[PDB]
Amino acid sequence: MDAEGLALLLPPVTLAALVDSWLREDCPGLNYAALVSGAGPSQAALWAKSPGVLAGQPFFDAIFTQLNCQVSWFLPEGSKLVPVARVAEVRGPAHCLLLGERVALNTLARCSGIASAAAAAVEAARGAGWTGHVAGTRKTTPGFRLVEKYGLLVGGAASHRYDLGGLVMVKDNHVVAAGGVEKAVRAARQAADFTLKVEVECSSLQEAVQAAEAGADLVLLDNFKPEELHPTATVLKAQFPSVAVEASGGITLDNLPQFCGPHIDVISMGMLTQAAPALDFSLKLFAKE
Template structure:
């Protein structure tokens, strides 16, 4: 998948709305610092100060478009970053450039952090010789879900379902509320049409078989140790080969290869979004006609 083309997935109106909300969050009232900077033309260089995968260019662009600034990128989406790399230049009125600075850096840092974490997870899976899908979850930061789900894709992982309308996800609490696995699946199928799959979270082989028997499309084997996961997945596939098997819970970058196996189709990790460290970027103004230099890291 070409990371450059992934921007086509992001509707311009949605990007503009997100950018507007982030800018309003940072400056809901007077922008007092704008009086100090004025509206004279200015330019700034964007520097990457930590290694990782560049992701989030469309969000960065959308924020600066809101404040009448233009971004010129020097590196493509999905590029491997090394400190200290010049990534882009931004030009526009000084007050607008500085108004967009923090929201734009926040979005880029968060999105790039998720992409970097996803790329490491995919590399671990492929290094184990496994061809299944590494996926994220809905464990995302409020207000940043689109950016984080997009970061997963740039990093080579699957985004999983975007929201509750993208998959009928029957979890353990749904099973308890419905009165059992079979009842939960059958009730879900009453409203799920041909465009929606039904996935059921299961804690045992018995539950997995019951879910498959009731018509589940996917079975999530949750919090299984690797030595339990693989025989359970094998037994389930032996009886229901069409059913997809997802493994989740307790998976980390270090132990991910242990969850890879021929009967597991998807491995999902909440930590790809929930625990991904943000990458470090800085945006520094420079005078026209001078060569921009990276700002020294504070001790």
């Protein structure tokens, strides 16, 4: 919960190995920019030039540690950013400093952007007194999910149980191939041999209702209109009481009030990751000394 203790969430080995691949991706051969740089001791200042939330310090750190550079932060992880802010200093050999600059900035930029979009969107949820949770989707970038998931958590959103946990989602496609929703749900509880929580993706009011009577614990109301969403939700908590309702599909920071309803527990926003602009950063080398 506390934004700063969350650095402890990232597993050191797979994070080291994930930063290793990125470094390899970007310089596959001889680095001629080093020959201009020299290997003289140097320093750079990291300027944040965008409003938002700051997230991604552990990835930033690990990248420069791999190049045996050191980094000193003046804002914590989760600080509000007010443009043109000194956030950090980086020290090490010039050529290693400039090797790690792209990857590092690029990583911080998008991580912060997704924390920033997430923060905005939870401030919109409390704005309309809504007392459910804002969540992300699995609509992440192949190869980059550790970073994006961390951003959502920093900016206050939540990883869906999809990998924050494990709930056996049934998508319509599951429903289609299983032969209807009832079949797919006992096949969903066939496997897990305990009080499981099963969730169904539902595109229409009829689908939602069959799913609940089939005994699902969450109903996902996908790509509904606010007009038809709340009537659908109200019935399904007159159906069963423990059935949570989740809303995804076409939800944006502006029109999110329209989805915050008396009768929705969760809102998943695909744009937290698919549409979030990257925060603007730059690493300007200050002195050589």
